Amino acid sequence: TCKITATPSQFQPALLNASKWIWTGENPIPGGSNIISTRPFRKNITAPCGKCSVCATIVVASDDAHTFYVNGVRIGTGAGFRQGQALFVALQPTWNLFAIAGQNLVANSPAGIMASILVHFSDGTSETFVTDESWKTLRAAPPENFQLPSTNDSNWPSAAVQGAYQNSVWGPPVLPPVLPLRGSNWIWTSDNVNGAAPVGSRAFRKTVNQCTKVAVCATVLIAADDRYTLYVNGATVGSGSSYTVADAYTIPNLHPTFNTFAINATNGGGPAGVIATILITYSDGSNETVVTDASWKAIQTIPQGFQPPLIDEFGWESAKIIGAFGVAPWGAGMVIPSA
């Protein structure tokens, strides 16, 4: 419906600071003891006039457990209030139905769900939406298909606020990392042997091409021992020079079927590696994760136009796995931006 003029940017974290814990109010004491039960929560959110909504970064926490739905599609299950859970999803352009099944699993114990939904719009702006008293709930188990847009929540009661981010029985949940590096690998060209690699630049390429789906947004987390520059479909996304502080990016304007991620990474001397995690959202509400591994292509002398999407990859080798995230010399302590 809308032209997307947003361009790749530094990733913007969704925060919980304005969000509220909600439950049903079966106990009128907020943060009070509640029965073992499952309860539904719904909120129809519409885009401000003239803007189209594209995708969302979501952080959700629960006491005790939750299932998160968008426009009837299950996008995540999780549990716990000490640390939020990160979710990413593509959106309909003008309205989106968010639905959460929350579960209290311990008798006589508090119950609640808290979520923050950072919507990104076609024009490059964003707005956060939160769980609060405007959500609808029921003092009963969730009806069949409670999460589908076709269910009528007109006669549902309002959710009851259990507490605020900074004033609740739970205290403020810690934000999770935007994406895990656990699961990815430090990779390099195969001249990386015995713990070091030659001085110089190396290039890496990964193409994602699900021709029967519509890709919407990508989130990228990347770090390199020494420095890198990152490209998507030939356009520059960003660059960094730290292997202890990782960078996160949002790509809001993906091509619908074919996207090439390319990295020029440089070694100043000593050990070398590049590591990344990429999440792509699809318009059917599914996602896929890509990590640096041996399915990337790599080359030791970088050719002109190493970044364009459709170059000939003859003479590119499979990238070498230096080690899974955590290996020496870099270890497991990478600083990762908050989701």
Ligand SMILES: *[C@@H]1O[C@H](CO)[C@@H](O[C@@H]2O[C@H](CO)[C@@H](O)[C@H](O)[C@H]2NC(C)=O)[C@H](O)[C@H]1NC(C)=O
């Ligand atoms: C991506 O989509 C999938 C399915 O829609 C989600 O992953 C699966 O579902 C649960 C929900 O968290 C995951 O914990 C499991 O690891 C997956 N199922 C398995 C391994 O059998 C995932 O939540 C989505 N990611 C988002 C929305 O960021």
Ligand SMILES: *[C@@H]1O[C@H](CO)[C@@H](O[C@@H]2O[C@H](CO)[C@@H](O)[C@H](O)[C@H]2NC(C)=O)[C@H](O)[C@H]1NC(C)=O
């Ligand atoms: C969420 O709200 C939107 C907007 O209030 C609803 O969309 C409207 O639906 C009516 C009835 O079908 C249409 O006549 C309007 O043209 C729609 N407006 C817009 C701006 O799309 C939407 O149906 C609601 N969704 C749910 C699940 O309640």
Ligand SMILES: *[C@@H]1O[C@H](CO)[C@@H](O[C@@H]2O[C@H](CO)[C@@H](O)[C@H](O)[C@H]2NC(C)=O)[C@H](O)[C@H]1NC(C)=O
């Ligand atoms: C790949 O990355 C390296 C480092 O960022 C680039 O090398 C730089 O090239 C410029 C010329 O435009 C020099 O002025 C800099 O001094 C170089 N820096 C370093 C650290 O060597 C290289 O040009 C990039 N692109 C390609 C295609 O290799």
Ligand SMILES: [Ca+2]
């Ligand atoms: Ca509980």
Ligand SMILES: [Ca+2]
């Ligand atoms: Ca080095």
